[PDB]
Amino acid sequence: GKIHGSLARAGKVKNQTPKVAKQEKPKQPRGRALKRLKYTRRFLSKKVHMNKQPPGKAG
Amino acid sequence: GPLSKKRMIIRDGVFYAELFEFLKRELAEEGFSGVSYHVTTLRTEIVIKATKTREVLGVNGRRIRELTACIQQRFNYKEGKLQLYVERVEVRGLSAMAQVESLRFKLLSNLQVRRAAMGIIRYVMESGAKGCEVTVGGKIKGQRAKSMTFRDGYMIKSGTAHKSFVDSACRHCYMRAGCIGVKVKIMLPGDSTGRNGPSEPLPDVITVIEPK
Amino acid sequence: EDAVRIVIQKALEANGLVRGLSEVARTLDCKTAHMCILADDCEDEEYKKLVTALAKQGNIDLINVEEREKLAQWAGLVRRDVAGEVTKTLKCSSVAIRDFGERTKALDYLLSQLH
Amino acid sequence: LDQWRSRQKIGMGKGARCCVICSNQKALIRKYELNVCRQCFRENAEHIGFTKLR
Amino acid sequence: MSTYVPKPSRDNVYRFFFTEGVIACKKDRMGTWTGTLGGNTFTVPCIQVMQLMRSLKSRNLIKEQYAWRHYYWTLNDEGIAYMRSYLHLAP
Amino acid sequence: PKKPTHRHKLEKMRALKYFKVTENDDGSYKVERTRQDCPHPQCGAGVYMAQHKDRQYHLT
RNA sequence: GGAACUUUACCAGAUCCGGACAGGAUGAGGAUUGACAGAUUGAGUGUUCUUUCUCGAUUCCCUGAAUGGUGGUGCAUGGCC
Ligand SMILES: [Mg+2]
Ligand SMILES: [Mg+2]
Incomplete structure (x- = not known):
């Protein structure tokens, strides 16, 4: 038919999302010490890619 | 049986065509650049053209030794019949x-x-x-x-x-x-x-x- | 039993060893195996000693060692790790040899051994 | 049981023959007892020695 | 045939493969392989030589390259040192 | 309609194939056999025949 | 691409592993291979069930994997046309 969506299909993708849970991951420092952690990695530990990702299916 | 002269130019071409494919696959990172083979009595010559003659030859010729006998065992040459060389491109x-x-x-x-x-x-x-x-x-x-x-x-x-x-x-x-x-x-x-x-x-x- | 250890790893080098129940029982009927060893202790089939029949009837040499499990730990018939020791040991009770030799087999002719 | 390749043991057919370069048994050149596949020959005509003059 | 390789064949193929260093075997799965220790008497089927070498390469002992319809297998530095232990030879 | 079994080889329980009586062996006799060989087909040395209703067995 | 079988990709069945190599439990006091006669079967096909001998560590049983495909997508591509 002309329309392929319905009100009955509401929340289709969010229901069938496989429901992964977050992992443990101990807390980062907060406040002034988190700015210390930002500064030491992007400056003291030497384009600059802030989030370089490992190679995937694009190459 | 002997083959005709028309039947021997075929098998001498398919010899060179197969010998070329083997060395193109092997010696790709040795900078391979062609083969010329010279056949006569008592010996069949094969000269390999390369850019990296320390690598297509082994440490004591080890690499060409293996690469010799791969051609010997395939094409059923006998001992003494097949000798290989490496020349470099100038x-x-x-x-x-x-x-x-x-x-x-x-x-x-x-x-x-x-x-x-x-x-x-x-x-x-x-x-x-x-x-x-x-x-x-x-x-x-x-x-x-x-x-x-x-x-x-x-x-x-x-x-x-x-x-x-x-x-x-x-x-x-x-x-x-x-x-x-x-x-x-x-x-x-x-x-x-x-x-x-x-x-x-x-x-x-x-x-x-x-x-x- | 320690001189028997050296003579059988020279036997697994060539060629040629027969181990167990086995066709070792078949080659002693043919009397082809030159020398054998087996258990001295009693095990399954009450240590039936048909090998003790089939050796001496075929004029074949025979040697008894007490420990029938861990008989040949040197030969490596048991699982390896390969970091640590061997695991739980299988039978390997009777071993027939037709092999070399040439190192301590001259010492194996001591004690007027069956001839 | 070793009935295993009993039809491929007898070698009379189009399945017994094969491209010697390219392992295929479809459309091979058997003229001059060459036994190369059609497509795998045009890649290798210059090394066999064939050149297209006309 | 069968990839079930008998023990008198496996050590006989390994005796050739340590001596010459290389084995070239056609991909024909109904044909034999012939090697030579002076007597040229192996007549091993090609099905079994593929199985022996596919077990070796999975244990990363050999280097395999494949031409038109022939395999070409070579021993490594670990592979020669491994092959000497199976044949029980002096270095 | 029903799947077959994919047969494994049966274990003989501490005997593949067997000899004869009087295991004392006091220097008089070799032990007798319990089947025959019928040799040169093909080996005949340690080839021992089956019973199979006392018929035969390899081959030889 | 003039396909009787093969080719072969399709359909009804039947085998075989060509599941390497690891790790774990059976294992030489046997891991397993193969098969004569019958029954099974389309099959004087040991595929399997009965029968018992052969093979002698190659295997097999689990777990993780890997290699094969004339499977898909030529609208992911290389190459050639
Ligand atoms: Mg040289
Ligand atoms: Mg013709």
Whole structure:
């Protein structure tokens, strides 16, 4: 038919999302010490890619 | 039963065609550049042209020793009949077969496609070549494939004389996302002895001589 | 029993060893195996000693060692790790040899051994 | 049981023959007892020695 | 045939493969392989030589390259040192 | 309609194939056999025949 | 691409592993291979069930994997046309 969506299909993708849970991951420092952690990695530990990702299916 | 002379030119061509494929697969990172085999009584010669003669030869000839007996066990030669040699290409910049295998490794080591291809053409054109043309085709940028060509100098393409003057070789680069094919065409400059290039000039160059 | 250890790893080098119930029982009927060893202790089939029949009837030499499990730990018939020791040991009770030799087999002709 | 390749043991057919380069048994050139596949020959005509003159 | 390789064949193929260093075997799965220790008497089927070498390469002991219809297998530095232990030879 | 079994080889329980009586062996006799060989097909040395209703068995 | 079988990709069945190599439990006091006669079967096909001998560590049983495909997508590509 002309329309392929319905009100009955509401929340289709969010229901069938496989429901992964977050992992443990101990807390980062907060406040002034988190700015210390930002500064030491992007400056003291030497384009600059802030989030370089490992190679995937694009190459 | 003996074969006819028509039946022996066939099996001598399929000999060279199979010998060429084996060494193209083996000696790709040794900078392989061709074979000439000379047959006579008491011995069959095979001369291998390469760019890396310390590597196609082993530490004591170990690599060519294994590479000898691979040809011996396949084609059923006897002991003493088959001897192999390695000669090096004198220029390395006029051999299109060597340069395309290096350009294969410049991409497989995750360098940029255009930086790699101009590194060939700078090296080929400084080595006395009259012209060069590198074509990289495949998924260069993303999901959909492109084609780029990179050019410098002369290039004869329409004649049947381009078999004499233009050296060509095409290989495949097996990326993580797909397959890229690279081509390298080099127009041979000179070398009237036939070291690299024909003796005679180009078919349309007239070059009137000056009087005494 | 320690001189028996050296003579059988020279036997697994060539060629040629028969181990167990076995066709070793078949080659002693043929009397082809030159020398054998087996268990001295009693095990399954009450240590039936048909090998003690089939050796001496075929004029074949015979040697008894007490430990029938861990009989040939040198020969490596048991699982390896390969970091640590061997695991739980299988039978390997009777071993027939037709092999070399040439190092301590001259010492194996001591004690007026069956001839 | 070793009925295993009993039809491929007898070698009379189009399945007994094969491209010597390219392992295929479809459209092979058997002229001059060459036994190369159609497509795998044009890649290898220059090394066998064939050049297209006309 | 069968990839079930008998023990007198496996050490006989390994005796050739340590001596010459290389084995070239056609991909024909109904044909034999012939090697030589002076007597040229192996007549091993090609099905079994593929199985022996596919077990070796999975244990990363050999280097395999494949031409038109022939395999070409070569021993490594670890592979020669491994092959000497199976045949029990002096270095 | 029903799946077959994919037969494994049966274990003989501490005897593949067997000899005869009087295991004392007091220097008088070799032990007798319990089947025959019928040799040169093909080996005949340690080839021992089956009973199979006392018929025969390899081959030889 | 003039296919009787093969080719072969399709349909009704039947075998075989060509599931390497690891890790774990059976294992030489046997891991397992193969098969004569019958029954099974389209099959004087040991495929399997009965029968018992052969093979002698190659295997097999679990777990993780890997290699094969004339499977898909030519609108992911190389190459050739
Ligand atoms: Mg040399
Ligand atoms: Mg003909």
